């Protein structure tokens, strides 16, 4: 920026004007725009070299928003740390960026890249006989690391529990650690003979992710992000089958574990004898030399109370030196104590699988030193238009609260108004009309409701079953089987239990009457249930996702706060002010003011052996 | 035969209830209640109630950044 006259509108852009630079003669071909200050990258997806840049930008820069036409990525320290590991240097990155960038790279951007791209590849964490050794191929690194306050071909032991501390210290210091597993030369760990049967198929994006993971040929450790229903189970099975080493899978549910195992056996040639399921019901482990242990975070992170059989299982897990760990729904590992399992459990390779790499607190960044960087991400609309996933007409219904309940809304405290604006009659009436219309349309409907009282009230009012925490496994399985294969039943009322990690090929329509506040991750996880509909490829099909919200309430605040991730992905919600033909339905719930008053009062009122014979 | 200067506020039951709460805390706000959708208010307080009602409603609206 030298001898560049500002424009009269330059004031409106506070240090954001980028007109001080000139455009290259080949702008018509170069598709990239680079932000010299915020690090945001604008990608033209409708110009030559767009495909060549779409993957490199994903590798070096995190995606902010990727709508239909113009893609938006961003370069950050974590993204550069992830990129520098897979055979990528500043020289190559700058060469490609200059060849694809309409504008020259600024010296500030060059300095920022150089500062962070030259501090990797000097330390390696290895494990030998259940002992963690921080081996470094160079000795001169000692003169600074051992002299640092925290730390302390040469190898020294380190406490297993102190891994979570040493890794974060390594992030703070110049050199971060990389976890590479050369399973080809790893002979100490017994091998497991399981391979993918011919019936298996790998989708193009799955193959691309596997290529990005195994490009160099040595298995690294990290995180994989794919949309719900994309085939994360098959990705994990492929990773296990290609590594061919002892593996432990951690899943945050029991039904999820059951289907995990069922798909595991179906997709690969794993013998039943070599398979073990570690749940609350049965705790037996495979007696073969090598096998797989599928358990849950509750069964791996508990340290105070353990059964006798579960104590033997925990002793087995700790004594044996595992070779691979697969963390399903890894967004919960940075919790207060779930992060402790990473440090305590011994394993040479850690893979995390999650459709969302965000969480409410700031601990999301801790994943970098807990399990590693993110490897691959996949777009939603791209797969929707390519036929890999379904298309959804997301809609937001505005249900006006009636005056009788609103007058109490004004006076009631924060805790009571929550139930008040969730149990408004208008929502009941709209739900009944929509249920009748969609049942005539022959759609399989799921109604989610976090609130157990609201779920029970709706179920008892509509004569339909409800499922929540108190429901037993057998009963809920019976409900699912009948809702699937029985022609009489077409709609069910699920709850927070079935929010994630459940495969419902038949489910097509999704409705939300009660939501768990502003939880953006739960929004996407709930949407994931209907993304694998059986009839998701027939011409003209469009799944439906309804979100009922009361206007002029904080429910609108939370609703607009919980969809900021779907909007970023590309999904757009359509506001439905009115549903046509609602009055013609014969009967509507809570249609009379007398019943409205009765419900108002009800909801407001809601808040010596011989002396043994004596006794 | 009697005329009274004032401002007529036409709205829906919800806005009417909000105005009723505001008047209950400040009696001078609403001069009279005409119907479940109409209220007579003081001319001077119109410019203040509009701004204060916008501030109050800002809570129900999520404005990032
Ligand atoms: N490559 C594939 N070939 C066949 N079916 C696939 C493939 N990828 C995913 N699926 C199907 O997608 C559905 C969801 O798979 P799952 O592993 O449960 O996904 P996730 O764990 O990501 O929710 C299953 O019906 C599975 O068979
Ligand atoms: F993301 Be899946 F539904 F396990
Ligand atoms: Mg899954």
Architecture overview:
The PDB classes it as transcription. The entry lists the keywords Pre-initiation complex, transcription. The entry is titled "Yeast RNA polymerase II transcription pre-initiation complex with initial transcription bubble". Chain A: General transcription and DNA repair factor IIH helicase subunit XPB. The organism of A is Saccharomyces cerevisiae (strain ATCC 204508 / S288c). The structure is cut from a larger assembly and holds chains A (615 residues) and B (65 residues). By secondary structure, chain A is an alpha/beta fold. Helices cover 36% and strands 15% of the residues of chain A. Chain A is built from 23 helices and 20 strands. In chain A, the strands form four sheets. Chain A has a seven-stranded parallel sheet with strand order 10-11-9-12-13-8-14. Chain A is globular. The termini of chain A are far apart. Chain B has 65 residues and is α+β, with helices and mostly antiparallel strands. Chain B has one domain. Chain B is 40% helix and 22% strand. Chain B has helices spanning 13-25, 46-58; strands at residues 7-10, 30-35, 38-41. Chain B has a three-stranded antiparallel sheet with strand order 1-3-2, covered by helices on one side. In chain B, strand 2 and strand 3 (38-41) form a beta hairpin. The interface between A and B is medium-sized, with 16 and 13 residues. Bound molecules: adenosine-5'-diphosphate, beryllium trifluoride ion (BEF) and magnesium ion.
